[PDB]
Point group: D2
Chain length 248, copies 4
């Protein structure tokens, strides 16, 4: 397929969007290596004949291990998808500094570090592509979600920085900015709200298509940006939000 | 990807438009392209599509194009608004007639054609529209006022269309190309290194590269993408 | 008087934001020349001690006449505020072409033309400033308001174009992008809570609040600000 | 003037834009408290009749102490300007993790923490305003300046987050995004002159005072319906790429 025999690294591929991305790449012929804190990642890799590495991306040593083991296992690195991320509820008034720093480490520092590590391996095969999974919440903010909004905002401009600095290595770097996608994490957030039915309706209506997106739909955008079909696209931020950011 | 689907492409005689027409035809689509330039005839023949000589500045001609194209293809599933013109000059030098002509072709025409095409798309349960804007619709350049204003208008019109056509199951997006090596560019030059260095990839883009982005946005693979503006500029807009 | 003795042109100053802008400049000692199609602009001018010109900005001849007569009355032109605008309800599917074209003429072509005309007067005094009143609806769209969305989107990029081309004449050009403001025009459309909830401040803005932003951008305090689009929306565009 | 009797906190006020900002607020009648790691900030405070606090903004304990002592000295806190910042040359390929983290701490975490601390003081006087000094490099990137581009990008969206969360406390939060400003640091780093200047439509570098004027406006009541906004003060740099 579009990625036959290509080595693809996907962070946080145990479930949700990451899992959809890992499966999409496998369906296109890629040799996939994914990591996650969740042991369920093992099953995902088994189903797609890929490799799984249980990794805590908050730790710089673990990030180094993941790229090394993935590179050795796959034999090459062509694509890196920075999908793993976390959040810490609260505005600047109540978020605790340690939790805030942890979100910045996992959501912003990790993608920066992993991109550098992956780039050095891509150099061996003449280049490659990196896709960062940001969010519409990296372009705009929401109440009580300071750490997430700050870190994703940083990820958006980091994507531009990486695009400029890695262009010489023939590595393109882009990001997708999803709107509300029906992943386990979102279904949980909705189900645990005081009025789940109402919440679901409200979230759906944030999009022009009046429905939540599907993980597979975000995966298709990532696949496109990581493919040679997007050869003149780099440093771009692509919203995959069913029209959310087109109107208030 | 588009086997048997009806696709309308404006300004398909050369450059990006021609590449777009060829790309859809390669994917099995029934393509109807229009242009003022007669060479569009050979493009249609080479890809097995239909050519219509149309002056998009004229509203009657726009109505005629969609009617004739719909009849010829049998259905309309995708519309690509690619045709455009420019009128050199700042607000201080541009003449009103030429300014209005640029707005008619670059902004009014896409609005009108989208409405006409949408009515046909309703017959097949929806579809997709892709507008070819420009980085010069998100930013400006010296002495190119009509182009900058019309393309800026096209960018927000894309958002408007996305909102109003969502109920009809029609997605609407736009691509914003940077410097692409088309006849128009390989004419304005007729500078070289300057334009190339405007991008991080340090080279001009190829028409085919913009076409691939257009095909993606027009495809079901972009099912949750609407109202979006995608730069295809080799990293130009990522830095100054 | 931050603008004491300076000549200021304000379009659409009979009511709403335009009226507030005219009053603000007058309060600061400026010689204000405001135009509008509505007759009540006369009373506004009388109350602030300025000059009123009943003009139909859709007419290019009247636009030329306005700047010429206003310049003569004031003795000099230092600032131009393009505030006049109209809308045509409807999506691309229902808007009439003639109405769409008229919205483009008044909302986009008129500001382009007036800026050029005013710039020639500002040259006499070594430069000046132009402030275009765009809208959040020039950066984003809403349902059934295609003409307004497209024209305001064009006005946003035209502001960038003008800033680039007029810098040589030492004329800064910026735009304000107001969110929901409590003007009679808005009060009519409404005839509430939802519109207020669109802003983080949870209230509609006052015309006077938009005027203050306009005066800032038109002042020397904003000497290194040009080609900028400043939202005056109570936080609306900061979140969904 | 616009800030007569108002308590204003300015970070990194020893030199450059921060110094221009402190001087501007004092010029408008404000009671200014500025901090900086550089001891010469004392001179700025003395010149404008304000208060100086030597502070290492990378340290959370010193940040808490700064707001506490500044609030005590001024008697009230109405405005906070997050101006202090640092950079760490290098792309993601060459930057050292520790320096990258330090840049995030000073450029992004510090403004977040300080905004929270200052907001609690503003609540005592019915609200206030916060202005973050971002950069055009928070909206776009440049070569080999990853830490700065990432932190400023985060600061831009943090500005939106703060605006949404502090609105109820009647606190507006906005940011300015300066282009090339002729600070002593920039004047020393400098064909090179012409190139940097030609990045702006005005074809010249901006003055620190010009950025200060925008900050004053956004922090004033004249900007009462402006919050969560990012205002470029770049002489037209971001209006064009050619
Ligand atoms: N679902 C949405 O609506 C939505 C919208 C916008 C952006 N996104 C982004 O999409 C991505 C995935 O979202 P999701 O909904 O699938 O969420 P998710 O909770 O499933 O998170 C992604 C994966 O990251 C893993 N992970 C988190 N911290 C880790 C760490 N320190 N080490 C290793 N693995 C770690 C998690 O275990 C999880 O499997 C994220 O970057 C998220 O910010 C999602
Ligand atoms: N080439 C670039 O670098 C570049 C950059 C940004 C945006 N774009 C956009 O891409 C599109 C195509 O660009 P291009 O470089 O191929 O230019 P082009 O000169 O080849 O123009 C496209 C086609 O439009 C046709 N056309 C123009 N006015 C027409 C009318 N009234 N009726 C019918 N046909 C008409 C022309 O004959 C031409 O074949 C345009 O919308 C342009 O604005 C191009
Ligand atoms: N009110 C809001 O919420 C809001 C929000 C965003 C942007 N805006 C913008 O602010 C500006 C003023 O808005 P407003 O609410 O006061 O509206 P308004 O209805 O009062 O319109 C402004 C003035 O323009 C005049 N005008 C219109 N067409 C004219 C023509 N051809 N010749 C001469 N005068 C003409 C009108 O008579 C009116 O007095 C407009 O540019 C509008 O798009 C307003
Ligand atoms: N100079 C420019 O061209 C330019 C352009 C865009 C944005 N900016 C922004 O404007 C602001 C000021 O820039 P500047 O040019 O005056 O730079 P600067 O080097 O003078 O730095 C500002 C001040 O911050 C202080 N500072 C740095 N780290 C500190 C710490 N840990 N604790 C306490 N004080 C600390 C420095 O001592 C200095 O006095 C910054 O936020 C910068 O990113 C500057």
């Amino acid at each position: 397929g579009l990625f036959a025999g290509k080595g693809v690294l996907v962070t946080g591929g145990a479930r949700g969007i990451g899992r959809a991305i890992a499966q999409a790449f496998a369906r296109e012929g890629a040799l996939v290596a994914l990591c996650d804190l969740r042991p369920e990642g093992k099953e995902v890799a088994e189903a797609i004949g890929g490799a799984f590495f249980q990794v805590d991306l908050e730790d710089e040593r673990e990030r180094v291990r993941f790229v090394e083991e993935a590179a050795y296992a796959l034999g090459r690195v062509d694509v890196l998808v920075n999908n793993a991320a976390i959040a810490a509820p609260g505005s600047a008034l109540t978020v605790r500094l340690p939790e805030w720093r942890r979100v910045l480490e996992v959501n912003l520092t990790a993608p920066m570090h992993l991109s550098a590590l992956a780039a050095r391996e891509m150099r061996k095969v003449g280049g490659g592509a990196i896709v960062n999974v940001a969010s519409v919440q990296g372009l705009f903010a929401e109440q009580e979600n300071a750490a997430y909004n700050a870190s994703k905002g940083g990820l958006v401009n980091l994507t531009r920085s990486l695009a400029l600095d890695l262009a010489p290595l023939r590595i393109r770097v882009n990001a997708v900015a999803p709107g509300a996608i029906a992943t386990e994490a979102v279904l949980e957030a909705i189900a645990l709200s005081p009025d789940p039915e109402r919440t679901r309706r409200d979230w759906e209506d944030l999009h022009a298509l009046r429905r939540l997106g599907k993980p597979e739909e975000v995966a298709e955008a990532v696949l496109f940006l990581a493919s040679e079909k997007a050869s003149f696209i780099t440093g771009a931020i692509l919203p995959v939000d069913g029209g959310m950011t087109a109107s208030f």
